[PDB]
Swiss-Prot record:
GO terms for cellular component: cytoplasmic vesicle. It comes from Thaumatococcus daniellii. It comes from the Eukaryota. Taste-modifying protein; intensely sweet-tasting. It is 100000 times sweeter than sucrose on a molar basis. InterPro entries: Osmotin/thaumatin-like_sf, Thaumatin, Thaumatin_CS. The keyword Nuclease does not apply. Belongs to the thaumatin family. Keywords: Cytoplasmic vesicle, Disulfide bond, Signal, Taste-modifying protein. This is Thaumatin I. Disulfide bonds join C9-C204, C56-C66, C71-C77, C121-C193, C126-C177, C134-C145, C149-C158, C159-C164. It is found in: Cytoplasmic vesicle. Gene3D superfamilies: Thaumatin (2.60.110.10). Coiled coil: none annotated. The keyword Disulfide bond applies.
Amino acid sequence: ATFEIVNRCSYTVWAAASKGDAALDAGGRQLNSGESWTINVEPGTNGGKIWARTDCYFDDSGSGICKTGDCGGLLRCKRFGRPPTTLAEFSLNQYGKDYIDISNIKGFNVPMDFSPTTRGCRGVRCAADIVGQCPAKLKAPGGGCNDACTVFQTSEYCCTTGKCGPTEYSRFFKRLCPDAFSYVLDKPTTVTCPGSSNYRVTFCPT
C-alpha cells in the first residue's frame, strides 16, 4: 500500500511511520514546508501509525531529539513516538478490508487529514487549533497538547481496567475534533475502506 505524506504546514516536520515493533518503510524523514514523501506499507500491516514530529535535531548518524513525537531519538523510527502526537492509525487487509482513523488518545501536536487516494470510502480529519485552545493543565511545555492519561496517570484517563467513561479532558478533544478518538472507549470513528486502498496523510490540511 502507498501512503503519500504531505506537509502543508508552514514549518518543517519530521514524518514518522511505525507499527510499534518495527519501522514502516524508512520509518522517518524530514519534510520541509510543502514537501511530499511517499512510503510503501506492506499489505496486512496491523496497528500501523503515522505521525509528525516537531522541532527536531539529528546528527549525521540519524540520532538526536524532537520536542514532540520523538521515537527513541532516531530519525528513522522503529517504535512509536513520545506524546503529544496526533495519530493517523491503520490496519490493512484485515479480512478483506482496511480500517483507518485519527486519534488524540496520545495527545495532539500537528493538525492532520488522513484520506484514501482510491475509491470506496471517506477520509478523516482533525485540523482544529487544539494546541492554541488546549486546557492549561494539558499544555505540554515542550510543545503540543497532552492527553489526560499522559499528564495524570489515572485508571480513568488511561482506561487501565477496560472500564472508563468520557472526561472533561476527553470532551475537549472531542469538541474540537469530533471525528477523532478522544479516549480509549470513545464511540468509534474508524472508517472501513476497501482492502488494499492507498492513502494520503496531510499535515496542516487547512
